[PDB]
Design a protein around this ligand. Sequence first.
Ligand SMILES: CC(=O)N[C@@H]1[C@@H](O[C@H]2O[C@H](CO)[C@H](O[C@H]3O[C@H](CO[C@@H]4O[C@@H](C)[C@H](O)[C@@H](O)[C@H]4O)[C@@H](O)[C@H](O)[C@H]3O)[C@H](O[C@@H]3O[C@H](CO)[C@@H](O)[C@H](O)[C@H]3NC(C)=O)[C@H]2O)[C@H](O)[C@@H](CO)O[C@@H]1O
Ligand SMILES: CC(=O)N[C@@H]1[C@@H](O[C@H]2O[C@H](CO)[C@H](O[C@H]3O[C@H](CO[C@@H]4O[C@@H](C)[C@H](O)[C@@H](O)[C@H]4O)[C@@H](O)[C@H](O)[C@H]3O)[C@H](O[C@@H]3O[C@H](CO)[C@@H](O)[C@H](O)[C@H]3NC(C)=O)[C@H]2O)[C@H](O)[C@@H](CO)O[C@@H]1O
Ligand SMILES: CC(=O)N[C@@H]1[C@@H](O[C@H]2O[C@H](CO)[C@H](O[C@H]3O[C@H](CO[C@@H]4O[C@@H](C)[C@H](O)[C@@H](O)[C@H]4O)[C@@H](O)[C@H](O)[C@H]3O)[C@H](O[C@@H]3O[C@H](CO)[C@@H](O)[C@H](O)[C@H]3NC(C)=O)[C@H]2O)[C@H](O)[C@@H](CO)O[C@@H]1O
Ligand code: NA
Ligand code: NA
Ligand code: NA
Ligand code: NA
Ligand code: NA
Ligand code: NA
Lengths: 597, 597, 597
Amino acid sequence: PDQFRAIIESPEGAGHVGYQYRRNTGSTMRMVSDVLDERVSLWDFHCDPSGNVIQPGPNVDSRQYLQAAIDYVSSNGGGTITIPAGYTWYLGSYGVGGIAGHSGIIQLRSNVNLNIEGRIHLSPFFDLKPFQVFVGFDNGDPASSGNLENCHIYGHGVVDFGGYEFGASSQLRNGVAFGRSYNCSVTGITFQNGDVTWAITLGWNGYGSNCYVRKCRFINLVNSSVNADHSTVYVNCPYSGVESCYFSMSSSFARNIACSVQLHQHDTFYRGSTVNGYCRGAYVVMHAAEAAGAGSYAYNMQVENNIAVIYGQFVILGSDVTATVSGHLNDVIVSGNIVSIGERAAFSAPFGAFIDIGPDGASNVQDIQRVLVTGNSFYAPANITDSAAITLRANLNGCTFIANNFDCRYMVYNAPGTTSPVVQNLVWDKSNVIGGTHANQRAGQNLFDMQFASVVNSTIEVQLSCEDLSMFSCILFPASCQLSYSKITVDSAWTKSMSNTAVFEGNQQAGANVYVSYPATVNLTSYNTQGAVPFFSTDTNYAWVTSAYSLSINENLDFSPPATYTNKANGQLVGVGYNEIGGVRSVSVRLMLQRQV
Amino acid sequence: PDQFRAIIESPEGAGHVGYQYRRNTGSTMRMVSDVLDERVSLWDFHCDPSGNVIQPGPNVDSRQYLQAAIDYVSSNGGGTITIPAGYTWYLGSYGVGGIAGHSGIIQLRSNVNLNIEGRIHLSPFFDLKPFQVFVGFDNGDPASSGNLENCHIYGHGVVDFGGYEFGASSQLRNGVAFGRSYNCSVTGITFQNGDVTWAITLGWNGYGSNCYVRKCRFINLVNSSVNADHSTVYVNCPYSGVESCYFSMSSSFARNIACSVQLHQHDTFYRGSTVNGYCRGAYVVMHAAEAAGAGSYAYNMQVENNIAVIYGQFVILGSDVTATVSGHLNDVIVSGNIVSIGERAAFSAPFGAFIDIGPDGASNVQDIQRVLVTGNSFYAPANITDSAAITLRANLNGCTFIANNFDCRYMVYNAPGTTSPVVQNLVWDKSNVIGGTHANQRAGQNLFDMQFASVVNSTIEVQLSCEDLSMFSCILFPASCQLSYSKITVDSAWTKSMSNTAVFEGNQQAGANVYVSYPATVNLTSYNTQGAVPFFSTDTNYAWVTSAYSLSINENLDFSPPATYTNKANGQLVGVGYNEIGGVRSVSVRLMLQRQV
Amino acid sequence: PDQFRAIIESPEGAGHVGYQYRRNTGSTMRMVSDVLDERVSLWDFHCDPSGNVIQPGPNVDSRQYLQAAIDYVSSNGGGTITIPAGYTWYLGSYGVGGIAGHSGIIQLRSNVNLNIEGRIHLSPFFDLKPFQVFVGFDNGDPASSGNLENCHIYGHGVVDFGGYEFGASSQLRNGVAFGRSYNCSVTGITFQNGDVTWAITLGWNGYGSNCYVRKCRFINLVNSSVNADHSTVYVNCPYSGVESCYFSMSSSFARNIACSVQLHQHDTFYRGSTVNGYCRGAYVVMHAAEAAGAGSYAYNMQVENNIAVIYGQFVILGSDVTATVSGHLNDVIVSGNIVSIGERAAFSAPFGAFIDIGPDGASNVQDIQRVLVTGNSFYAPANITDSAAITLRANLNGCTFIANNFDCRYMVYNAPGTTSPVVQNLVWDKSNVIGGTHANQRAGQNLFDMQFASVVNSTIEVQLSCEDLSMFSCILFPASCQLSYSKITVDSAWTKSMSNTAVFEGNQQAGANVYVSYPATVNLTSYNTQGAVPFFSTDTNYAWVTSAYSLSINENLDFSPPATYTNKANGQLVGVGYNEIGGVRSVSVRLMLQRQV
Ligand SMILES: CC(=O)N[C@@H]1[C@@H](O[C@H]2O[C@H](CO)[C@H](O[C@H]3O[C@H](CO[C@@H]4O[C@@H](C)[C@H](O)[C@@H](O)[C@H]4O)[C@@H](O)[C@H](O)[C@H]3O)[C@H](O[C@@H]3O[C@H](CO)[C@@H](O)[C@H](O)[C@H]3NC(C)=O)[C@H]2O)[C@H](O)[C@@H](CO)O[C@@H]1O
Ligand SMILES: CC(=O)N[C@@H]1[C@@H](O[C@H]2O[C@H](CO)[C@H](O[C@H]3O[C@H](CO[C@@H]4O[C@@H](C)[C@H](O)[C@@H](O)[C@H]4O)[C@@H](O)[C@H](O)[C@H]3O)[C@H](O[C@@H]3O[C@H](CO)[C@@H](O)[C@H](O)[C@H]3NC(C)=O)[C@H]2O)[C@H](O)[C@@H](CO)O[C@@H]1O
Ligand SMILES: CC(=O)N[C@@H]1[C@@H](O[C@H]2O[C@H](CO)[C@H](O[C@H]3O[C@H](CO[C@@H]4O[C@@H](C)[C@H](O)[C@@H](O)[C@H]4O)[C@@H](O)[C@H](O)[C@H]3O)[C@H](O[C@@H]3O[C@H](CO)[C@@H](O)[C@H](O)[C@H]3NC(C)=O)[C@H]2O)[C@H](O)[C@@H](CO)O[C@@H]1O
Ligand code: NA
Ligand code: NA
Ligand code: NA
Ligand code: NA
Ligand code: NA
Ligand code: NA
C-alpha cells in the first residue's frame, strides 16, 4: 500500500498498471509496459549509467547508446529501432570489435532495422579521418565475416557527414556498408554534406543477395581535391539495385572524379534515377578480383530510364582478369535514358561519352559482349569537342546500338596514337539518329573515327539528318585498321556536297567479305558512237565496285550517261548510255558506289 | 498519498508511472508519458476548451484541431501526426493568415508529416466555393512566401472533396499545394469525388526541388460544366515527378477538359502510371511566366512507361514568351507508353493525338527541339477521323520519332487554313510502323498531310505494312509549303495500285537539296531499232529525277524495256532496253523514281 | 482508496491514469489506455480464455487469435494490426465459414491491414493438404461473394509455407487470395519454402480494381513432381499489376511448370522485376471464362523493364472462347526486358522463346492483335536448338517487332506437322538485330521457318550481322503456306556465300501483291555482237522478277555484263552490257533479285 506507490513510481510501475485493448472483454489482459515494449527507440538506451536520459547534441556522443540499442534488439530476434524526429544525434567516436578494421562507427545486426526520422550528424572528431558510419561486417577481415541479413534503414531522416574534408587520398569513407548482405535495403534517406568515397555499398565481392537502394537522396558528397575517387552506390552482390534515387554534386572536383553507381555483379539494375553534377553515371564492370561470391560473369545488367547531366561518361563497360580468374561482362541493356554533358569547355573534364569501353589501365583483357543500347537520348553542347556516342578505347567483343538519338561531336571515337582496340560485333543500326548540334564544328574530324587495330563482324549504317560540310568524312578507317566481314554504308541524304563520305586509307573496302556503299563524284568519258554507247571512268580506282548508280540529274538533251554501272578489271567503271547524236561525251556525276550490296 | 491518487488521475499521471524497456537494467528509466510522447495523433488536439475529446463527424469541423496539431509539432522541430483510421474527419471552415489568400483550409509546416490513415472529407460549407485543402505557402503572395521543406503526406487514407460542383468558372480548387516546396511528397493517398482544378501542385514558378507523387489514386475529380480546366498534378519545380499513380475520370466533361500531369520545369518525370477517362495525358511546357525559380529552360523531361485511354492528346509540347523572358523546351524523351483514344464519335472531343505541338494561342513563339519519341504504341478506333501520331499545329524546331507503332487516321497532320507552322528537324525514321486499323477510311485524305509554311532539315521515311487504296496520297505537300534540305521517301511495299504516292503540289521535290524517292506509273515509247534501243517517257515531268528503276514485270518475249533510267533536259526519262526484233514499243511501267538517293 | 489500487492493477487501470501530450496545456486530457488504443497487435488477441497471453511457437496454433483480431478491428471501421517482429506465429487449422470452401486459413476483411513484421509459418497439419493462407472472399461461391476493399499486407516479414509437398495434383495452394478485390496490395513481404499453385492472386474473373504487388520476394515455391502447375502472381482484375518484385526457384520441377505472372484483365502491368529458375515469365491472356467482371477484352497490357533467366517462354500471348463468350487480346506492349534461356540441354524443357503464341489446346480460336514488341534483349546459349524469338504456334491477328536484339537458334519458328497457324499482320522490322551465338549450329534449319497455313499483310526484313553458312536458308516458306500482300526481304550483307537465301517451295513470291528481294547466283550468256550486247539467264525461273542488279565484281577487261536486269515472258532475265571486242560471253554472277521493290 506504501509499497504500491513505490512500485508505481519505480521503473516496474508500468508493469503493474493493467490494460485491455479498447475494453474488449475478449482481448488479452496485459500491463501497460507490455504495450510499450512493442516499440523501441534511441530514447530507451540514450541514458547515463544511473538510467537518467541524456539530451543529444553537439557535445554528446550518441554512438554507444545506439550501439546498445542495436545489440539489445538483436538479442530478441530483431525489430525496428526509431531514431526520433525533431532531434539531431551526433556521432563522436569509433566503434570497436569487428568494425574497427573498417573504421566503423556503428555495427548493424541482422533483423534489426533502423527507422531514421531525425538527423544523424558526424562530430568534428571525424575531421580529416576515415570512417564508415554503419557497418554490417562483423570481422576486420571480410572473408571471415558472418552475414548481415534482413536489415533495413528507412524513414524521412538524414545522414549528414558534417562537411569535413578527407585528410589523405588513401583514406576511405562510407555511409552504409551492408557487408555480406542478404535482404538489406536503404529507403527514403538523405545522405548529404560530405567528402566520401561512397554513400552506400551493397554486398562484398559477390556475397550477398537482394540488396536495394530506393527513393534516397545523395547531395554534395564530394568537396575537396584530396578525395581520390567517389562512387555513390557500389553494388557488389547480385539480385540487387538502385531505383528512383536522386544524386546531386556541386563541387568542381565531383565533375572529374564522381560516379553515381557501380554495378559489379549479375542481375543488378540502376533505374528511374536523376543525376546532376557528376563526372560519370554508372560503371557496369566484372572485376575478376570481386568474383568470389557469385562467379566470374556479370550478366543481366540493366541501366534504364534515368535522367542525367554529367561531365564525363554516362555508362562505362569493362572487365578484367587476375592471375587465376578471368572476368566476363555480357547481357547488358542500356535503355530509355536521357543524358546530356553539362555546359563546360572542351577538354576541361574527362572525355564526354554516352558509352565508354572500359575501364582499366590495360585494354587487351576485356571480354564484353551482347550489350544492347537502345532508345536513349544523348546531347552535348556544340563547343564540346570531346563528346562521343561511344569512346571505344579497349577491346570489344560486341555492342549493339538501335534506335538511339545521339547529338554530339563524334558517333564512334577513339584517339589515334593511343590504344589499338580489337573490335568485334559492333552494330550501329540505321535507326540511330545523328543530330545536328555540332554541324559546322567538325573541320579536320571524322564523324565515325575508326581508330582501331581491327574491325570484324561489324555494321555501321550512317544516316545523316542534316548537312555538315565541315567534317572531313562521315567514316574513316586508317590503313592500320584491318576490316573484314563487315557492312559499312553511308546514306546519300545531305551528302551531295561532301568530298569524302567514307574513307578507307588502306583500301580495306576491297576485302572479299566487306559489304559497302557510299556516294562519290566520278568523271566519265564516252566513246563517240551514235546510239547505245559506253561511258567509262577516267580514274581506275573502282576494281572493288560491284555496281553504281546515278545520283545526279542529266542536264543534256543530246545524250544521257548510264543510269547504272559495273566495273572492269583495270579498275574503271563502265555503263551503257545513249547518244541521240554521236560525239565523245565528258561528264561529272555523283554516284552511289556499291560493293556486294 | 491522497496527493498520489490525484496526481495519477490527473493529466500528469502518466508522468509519474515508471517504465524501463523490457525490464532491461541497461535501458533508460523513463515515465510512461515519455514513451507516449514519441507519437502524436489528431486525438491529442481534437478537444474542447476544457480538454475533453470531441468525436469527429459531419457536424464537427476538425480544422482548428488539425491546425493546432501541425502548429505544435512544428514548434518541436517536426514529426509525423497520424490522422486515425476508422474515422472520417470533416473540414468545415477556411484557415487564416498566409493561406487565406490561397483559399487555404490547412497550413502545412516544415518537417511536419501527415500520416493519413482515416478519411478527410469536406463539409457542405464548401459547396460552390473555392478551396485548397493543404497549403504550404505562408503568405498570400507567393513571391513573399517562405519555403515548405521536408513535408510528407502518406498512408492508406482518403481525401474526399464531397462531390460539390464549382460555383463559378473563375474559382480554383486544389487538394495539396506544397508551395515553394523542397523535399515534399505525397504517397499512397486516394483523392476522390470532386470538381477541382488540381489535386496536387508541386513547387511555385520554379522554386522548389525533390517533390514527388507516388502510388496515389485520383478518382473522379471533375464533375461539372462549370469547371473551367483541370490538371491532376502540376509539377512546377525541378528534380520532381509523378511515378506509379492511377488516374480515373468518368464525367463527360473530363473528356474535354482534363489532363493528368503538367511537367513545367527541368528534370521532371511522369512514369509508370495508368490513366482512364481524361482528355489529355501530359503537357510538357516551359512557360516564360513560370521561369523565376529555375530559369527559362525545361530540359530533361521524361514521359515513360505509362498506360492511357484518353479522348484528346497524349503528350502536348510547348513553350512561350513574356515581354521580358523567353521560354525554351528541349531534351525530352517520350518512351514505352501504350495509349489509345477511347471509343467516341469523330470530332466529339479535342483532336486525338499521340503528340501535339503545343499549347497556346499563338504558334510563332515556340522553341521546342531535341525531343525523342521512341518505342511507344498508339491506337485509335477506325471511325476516329481526328486521330494523328502528331498534330503539328505550331512552330517546331525539332522532334525525332523512332521505332514507334502508330495505328490511327493520320501520321503527320495539321489543318489547312489554320496555322502555318515553320517546321525544322522533324525526323520520322523508317522504323515507325504504320498500322492498318484505318485502312479504307481515308478517302480524300493524305496520310502525312504536310500543311506547313515550310519544312527544312526534315526526314519522312514512309513505310506501309498493309494496303490502303482509299487514301489520296501517302504524303502531300501543298504549293504553299516550302521544302528544302530534306529527305522524303515512300517504300513501294503495298503501293503498287496507288495513283498517288507522294505529291508535291508546288513541285518542291525539285529543290537542289531535296532527296526523294517514290513509286509512279510512267508510259514509255521506244525507237524502232533492233538491238539495244532507247525508251523514253511520253510525259516531260521528270527533270528532277536522278534515276529510276522498274517495279513491273515484262510480259514480252520479243523485247524488254530498260531496267533503269536517267533523265534528259526536256524532262523525259530515258533508258536502254533491248529489241530482239525491231519495232516501236509502247509500255506502261511502275517505276521507283529517285532524286539524289 | 483500496478500490484505487485494485482499479489500477485491473485491466481498466490504464483507463484511470491521465495523460496530456508533452504537458501541452492545449492538448486533450486523455487516459493512457486511449493512446494505447491507437495501435493494435496480435498480442492483444493471442490469449487464453482467461485473458492470459500465450507465447507463439510450433505447438501453438495462432490462427483463431489472428482471426479474432481481424474480426474486431473490422467492427471499428478498420485499422492496421501488427504481427510482431522477433516471433514466429504458426498457423495450425482451417478457418470456417465462407473461406472453408476455398480451403482458407485466415479471412481478410475490408479496411483491415496487416503489418507483418515477424514470420508466419504453416504447421505440419497442412502437410499434403490444400490451403489458401489469406482469403478475401466471404462466400464459398465467389459469384455470391461480397468484395474485399482497402486491405493492404505489408512489412519486412515472411510467409513460410513449411516446405510441405502437395498431396495430389488436383489440390490448390495459395498465399493471398484477395478475392473480389478493390484497392488491395502486398508490399515488402517474402513468400518462401513451399509447393503451391500461387503465392498471390488478385481479383476474381474481372471483378476488382487497383490491386498491386510491389517489392515482394518469392523464393522456392515449387518443390515436387506432384505440383501440377504454378503461377506466382495471378492478376485477374483490371487496373492492377506487379512492380519491382523478385522471383526465384531452384527446383528442377519449376523449370518445367512455373510462371512468375499471369496478366488476365485490361490495364494490367508487370514491370521492373527479376526472375530466376522459372519455366515462364508471363502469360498475357484473355480467357472468355474469366470475362464476367471487366468484359471480354484484355487491352493495355504492359510487360516492361524486367530481367529474367527462364527455361521456357518469356511472354505467352493468348485468348479463347466459351460457348457464349469470345475473348480478345489487343494493345499489348513488351519493352525493355533483358531475358536469357538458362544453361540446359536442348529439348530438356519446354521450347525456349521470347514470345509464344498462345496458350491452349486449340489454335484456331485466338484473337490476338496490336501487339508491340520493342527494345528487348534475348539470348540463348548456342546448344539450345529449341530457342526462338517467336514460336508462332496458333492463329495470330498481329504482332509487331521493332528494334529488338535476338540471339538464339530461330527468329520465327513453328514445328512442321503440328499446327497450321493462320498469320496476319506479323511485322519484323529491319531494325531487329539477329545475333551470332548460334552461327554454325544451323545445319538443316531455316532461320525464319514459316510453317504456317497462310501469311498475309506481313513484313519480314531479314538483316544478318554475321555469317552463318550452316543454315539451309534465311527464310523458307513450304508449298502449303499461302503468302499474299506481304513484304519479304533479305539484305545481302554476310550472304554472298549462301546457296539459298529465301526459299519459296510453292513459288509464292510470284503472287501479284508479294513484294520481295533476295540474293541469288545466276548464270548468264551473251550474244556475240561487239558493242552494246544483251546477256540472258540460262535458266527460266525468273518470270516474277521486276529488276535485278549485280552484287559481283567484273574480273574482265574485254567486256562487262549488265549492271541491271529485267525479265522476259519466258522466265529469263535480260540486261544490256558491253562487248569491247565481240564474242559470246558466259558468266556467273551474284544478283539481288527484286520484285515490286
Ligand atoms: C570509388 C570507387 O568505387 N571507384 C571505382 C573503382 O573501385 C576500386 O577502387 C575503389 C577506390 O576507392 C575501391 O578500392 C578501395 O577500397 C578497397 C576495399 O576496401 C577494403 O575492403 C573493405 C571491405 C573494407 O571496409 C575497407 O576498410 C578496406 O579493407 C581497397 O582494398 C582498396 O585498397 C581501396 O583503394 C574499390 O574496392 C572495392 O570496394 C567495394 C565497395 O566497398 C568492395 O565491395 C569491394 O570489395 C572492393 N573491391 C576490391 C577488389 O577490393 C575498387 O574496386 C573501380 O575499380 C572502377 C571501375 O569500376 O570504378 C570506380 O573508379
Ligand atoms: C488547370 C491547369 O493547370 N491548366 C493548364 C494551364 O495552366 C494555366 O491555367 C491554369 C488554369 O487553372 C492556372 O491558372 C490559374 O491559376 C493561376 C495561379 O493561381 C494563383 O497563384 C497560386 C500560387 C495561388 O494559390 C492562387 O490562389 C492564385 O493566386 C492564376 O494566376 C490564374 O489566374 C488562374 O487562371 C495555371 O497557373 C499556374 O498554376 C500553378 C499550379 O497552381 C502554379 O504553380 C503556377 O504559378 C501558375 N502559373 C502562373 C503563370 O501563374 C496556368 O499556368 C497551362 O498553361 C496549359 C499549358 O500547360 O495546360 C493546362 O491547360
Ligand atoms: C497455375 C496457373 O495459374 N496456371 C495458369 C492457367 O490457369 C488455369 O489453371 C489453373 C491451374 O491451377 C487454375 O485452375 C484451377 O483453379 C481454378 C479456380 O479455383 C477455384 O475458384 C477459386 C476462386 C477458389 O478459391 C478455389 O477453391 C476453386 O474453387 C479451378 O476452377 C480449376 O478447376 C483449377 O484447375 C486457373 O483458374 C483461375 O484461378 C484464378 C486465380 O485463382 C482465379 O482468379 C480464376 O477465377 C480461375 N479461372 C477460372 C476459369 O476458374 C485456370 O485459369 C492458365 O489458363 C494458363 C494460360 O494463362 O496459364 C497458366 O497455366
Ligand atoms: Na579494412
Ligand atoms: Na591493325
Ligand atoms: Na491567391
Ligand atoms: Na510558305
Ligand atoms: Na473452392
Ligand atoms: Na495452307
